[PDB]
Amino acid sequence: QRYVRKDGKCNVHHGNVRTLVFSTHAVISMRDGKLCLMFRVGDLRNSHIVEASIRAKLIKSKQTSEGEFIPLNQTDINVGYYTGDDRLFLVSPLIISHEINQQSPFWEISKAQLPKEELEIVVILEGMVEATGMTCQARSSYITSEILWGYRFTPVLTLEDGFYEVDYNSFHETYETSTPSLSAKELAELANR
Amino acid sequence: QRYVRKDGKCNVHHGNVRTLVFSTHAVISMRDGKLCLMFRVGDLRNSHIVEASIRAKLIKSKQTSEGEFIPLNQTDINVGYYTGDDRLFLVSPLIISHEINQQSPFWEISKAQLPKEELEIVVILEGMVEATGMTCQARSSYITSEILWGYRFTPVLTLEDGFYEVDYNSFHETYETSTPSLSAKELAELANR
Amino acid sequence: QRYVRKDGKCNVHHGNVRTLVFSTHAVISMRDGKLCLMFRVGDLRNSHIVEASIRAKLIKSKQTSEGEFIPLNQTDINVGYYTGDDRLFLVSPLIISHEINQQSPFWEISKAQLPKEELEIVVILEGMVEATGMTCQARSSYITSEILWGYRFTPVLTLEDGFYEVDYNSFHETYETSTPSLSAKELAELANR
Amino acid sequence: QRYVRKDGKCNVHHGNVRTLVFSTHAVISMRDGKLCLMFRVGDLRNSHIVEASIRAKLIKSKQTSEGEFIPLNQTDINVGYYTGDDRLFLVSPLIISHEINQQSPFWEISKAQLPKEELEIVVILEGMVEATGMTCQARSSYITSEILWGYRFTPVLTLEDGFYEVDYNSFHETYETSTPSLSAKELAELANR
Ligand SMILES: [Cs+]
Ligand SMILES: [Cs+]
Ligand SMILES: [Cs+]
Ligand SMILES: [Cs+]
Ligand SMILES: [Cs+]
Ligand SMILES: [Cs+]
Ligand SMILES: [Cs+]
Ligand SMILES: [Cs+]
Ligand SMILES: [Mg+2]
Structure with missing residues (x-):
């Protein structure tokens, strides 16, 4: 059941005409043995977004080994660059x-x-x-x-009568899942041996 | 016989004035010993497309080793990034x-x-x-x-009286060609030894 | 105390409505044991700049080992590419x-x-x-x-009553700091042994 | 003698107000022991070009080791990507x-x-x-x-009374220079031993 038609129209949101929300929370949990920070990002019901891209910064004041204090210092979190x-x-x-x-x-x-x-x-x-x-x-x-x-994000996407529908009331919803309480570094150490 | 003139005009489509189609099918076959997935993409007869770029996503529902089900999950297929x-x-x-x-x-x-x-x-x-x-x-x-x-794509491009012409009736046409039925991984294994 | 609100508005410059200056000087000094060339770049008080990016070129005439003289030759200085x-x-x-x-x-x-x-x-x-x-x-x-x-750049950013304020009179200001007088190459040599 | 003023205006083309030409020929010759293909590209006298970038394609019909003939096949020549x-x-x-x-x-x-x-x-x-x-x-x-x-490109850039001037009559001009007649691969082989 096609996600995208041969002509490029998408079978999502029956009867659309083609403000953008981020999930209120972020989750951390394992995916394929790797620990992942994840957040969710919605589409715009009524228009495509060409050349879309996502980036993320980490705001965190820090002190260099030489005592320079950098308030609200920025560093780029890797999200598929x-x-x-x-x-x-x-x-x-x-x-x-x-x-x-x-x-x-x-x-x-x-x-x-x-x-x-x-x-x-x-x-x-x-x-x-x-x-x-x-x-x-x-x-x-x-x-x-x-x-x-x-935690993990609740899924929101269901297939109904040849279009795909989005339950937007689950958009921000997440559920608990068994997940080690160790840091990624620690997990790596532990695993390697 | 120049494809592009010194001044930047192209010798394609005699008497043009400078909707975009993808081939209906994709093919897989060997090129220079490497196995390749290929599809075809037409130009617009009557205008250049500046800053053109192609990308491709793989839509495929999957389950992580931790049982998280990701419907219609996206991953980026490499097409010359x-x-x-x-x-x-x-x-x-x-x-x-x-x-x-x-x-x-x-x-x-x-x-x-x-x-x-x-x-x-x-x-x-x-x-x-x-x-x-x-x-x-x-x-x-x-x-x-x-x-x-x-399979492979039929060629469509011929040179006629100093311009290059496109047989658009061959655009979607493909032909059969001897091609191993083994997966790329398997081919690699087999070859290496 | 949030730098950015859940809805994407920033808590900077109380009562803004959302010409751009570079610092007059550049500084060189250690950060986390690495020697760094640094300059400062201000925001526009009254508007965001989407898709912002910074690059830097080095203008420097040079002679190749074959005696070709290249006046005001350009090379790209790495600033997080x-x-x-x-x-x-x-x-x-x-x-x-x-x-x-x-x-x-x-x-x-x-x-x-x-x-x-x-x-x-x-x-x-x-x-x-x-x-x-x-x-x-x-x-x-x-x-x-x-x-x-x-030298290093004076900080300019303070938190006041839930917004962050910028002392623009410190924008160009810098202060002295203990810093080896050796070249980066030399420092590397020295350190490695 | 500054190429660019602190405020970002350039000291080039006295009395400008801030069609684009490529050199008619390309040259090949050594630069710092590496063999280089080079061509020249002019500015627009009367306006800056933001976000400028250059790329180059190689048009060359080819036959794969499996006999697929690809007419006027494209491949991307590396010019600082x-x-x-x-x-x-x-x-x-x-x-x-x-x-x-x-x-x-x-x-x-x-x-x-x-x-x-x-x-x-x-x-x-x-x-x-x-x-x-x-x-x-x-x-x-x-x-x-x-x-x-x-060959090499004649230089065109001179400094005159605090602005830099361009002799556009030398734009396309090139001169001969001692240069081995061996292919880059061959040079590499020869040199390595
Ligand atoms: Cs973008
Ligand atoms: Cs990239
Ligand atoms: Cs693009
Ligand atoms: Cs890239
Ligand atoms: Cs940009
Ligand atoms: Cs990049
Ligand atoms: Cs560009
Ligand atoms: Cs790149
Ligand atoms: Mg753009």
């Missing part, structure tokens, strides 16, 4: 995933360490509005208390 | 090629495995219309039954 | 940092060698103006006498 | 250089082999016009007889 998976094809809500690896700022952050960290994730979508011919930027924010450790 | 061969110079139909390697989702997919897979390839061209000064997105789709294994 | 840290989220002044490594043109340049070099750094920001829907380019320049060796 | 040196700061004519290495299509092409090759280089600049707020594409072409082996 290298493989071009940041280039979105937004035609229904997507879970964006940041794999927490050796280069990720969350490498050394455990379930317990987490609420003691003072940091904020800024998510930024940017694209051109299909109809409007204009460049949009949509932004949102997550702080330490809004990253739910050990 | 790294070398900038995705940056198209569209002035006649082009065969876009995805080399099926260790990173490709088709790595483990044989001729027989193929029709049993439930997946869909979304192709998306994007550029600015030379004349119209506006950002376009053109899309199309291939499902398992529309990828012809062991 | 690879990790996408050049993709700015400009909502207050940012210190842009170029880590002076083996690929950097300053690799072999010491504190003493510096004023004897005849070179110029061109910095170029580019983005779309949130409101104006138009592509802007802002440029500035640093010459040998405008790179202060052994 | 990886280091972002393709991102031009066009404010006077620039020599664009493609280093002929193991990945370059000219790797195996000698001075003698050259005129027997049937190939064409398409060069494409793209950017937004500073004033006009519009996306431009400028194109040109080089065929085998227009790549002068063993």
Whole structure:
């Protein structure tokens, strides 16, 4: 049952005519053995967004080994830059995933360490509005208390009579799932041996 | 016999004035010993497309090793991201090629495995219309039954009286060619020894 | 105390309504044991800049090992191209940092060698103006006498009653800090052993 | 003597107000021991070009090891994609250089082999016009007889009374220079031992 028709029209949202929401929370949990920070990003019901892309910054004041204090310092969280998976094809809500690896700022952050960290994730979508011919930027924010450790996003997408429908009342909904409380670094150590 | 004149005008489509089609099917076959998924993408007879680029997504529901079910999950099929061969110079139909390697989702997919897979390839061209000064997105789709294994695209381009002409009646046409029925992974294994 | 609200509005510049300055000087100094060339770049008080990015060129006449003289030759100074840290989220002044490594043109340049070099750094920001829907380019320049060796930028950002304020009278201000007078290459050599 | 003023205005073309030409020929010759294909690209006297970038394609019909004939097949010639040196700061004519290495299509092409090759280089600049707020594409072409082996571009840039002037009558001019007649591959072989 096709997601996209041969002519490029999408079988989503029966009877559409082709403000953008981010999930209120972010989740952390395992996917294929890798620990992932994930948040959700909705489509615009009534228009495509050409050249869509997602990026995320980490706002976190820091001190260099030489004592320079950098308030609200920015660093770029990896959400598919290298493989071009940041280039979105937004035609229904997507879970964006940041794999927490050796280069990720969350490498050394455990379930317990987490609420003691003072940091904020800024998510930024940017694209051109299909109809409007204009460049949009949509932004949102997550702080330490809004990253739910050990959770996943409820799915929202069902197939009904040859179109795909979105239950937007589940958009922000998440559920709990068995998930180690160790930091990614620790997990790596433990696993390797 | 020049494809492009010193002043930048192209010797294609005698008497042009400078809707975009994708081939109805995709083909898989060997090119220089590498197995390739290929589809074709036409130009617009009557205008250049500045900053053209092609990308492709794989729509395929999946289950993580932790049992999270991701319906119609997206992953980015490599069509020249790294070398900038995705940056198209569209002035006649082009065969876009995805080399099926260790990173490709088709790595483990044989001729027989193929029709049993439930997946869909979304192709998306994007550029600015030379004349119209506006950002376009053109899309199309291939499902398992529309990828012809062991085929190639008929050529369409002939040189006639100092211009190059396109036989658009061959645009979607393909022909059969000797092609192993083994998956790319298998071919690799076999070859290496 | 949030930098960005859940709805994407920023808590910066109480009572704003959402010309761009570069710092007059550049500084060189250690950050986390790496030697860095840094300059500062302000926001526009009264509008966001979508798709912001920074690049920098090195203007420096040179002679090839074959005696070709290239006047005012250009080479690209690395300011976060690879990790996408050049993709700015400009909502207050940012210190842009170029880590002076083996690929950097300053690799072999010491504190003493510096004023004897005849070179110029061109910095170029580019983005779309949130409101104006138009592509802007802002440029500035640093010459040998405008790179202060052994300095850092004064911070400018303070938190006041739930908004963040910018002391623009400190924008261009810098202070001295203990910093080795050896070139990056030399430091590397010395350290490694 | 500044190339760019602190406020971002350029000291080029006294009394300007801020059609684009490519050199008629391309040259091949050594730069710092590496063999380089080079062509020249002028600025627009009377406007900046924001977000400028250069790419080049190789048009060359080919036959795969499986006998598929691909007429006027395209492949992307590397002109600074990886280091972002393709991102031009066009404010006077620039020599664009493609280093002929193991990945370059000219790797195996000698001075003698050259005129027997049937190939064409398409060069494409793209950017937004500073004033006009519009996306431009400028194109040109080089065929085998227009790549002068063993040459260099005459310089065109002189400094006069605090502005830099361009002698546009030298734009297309080139001069001969001692240059080995061996292919890049061959040179590599020879040198390594
Ligand atoms: Cs990238
Ligand atoms: Cs974008
Ligand atoms: Cs890329
Ligand atoms: Cs594009
Ligand atoms: Cs990049
Ligand atoms: Cs940009
Ligand atoms: Cs790139
Ligand atoms: Cs561009
Ligand atoms: Mg653009």
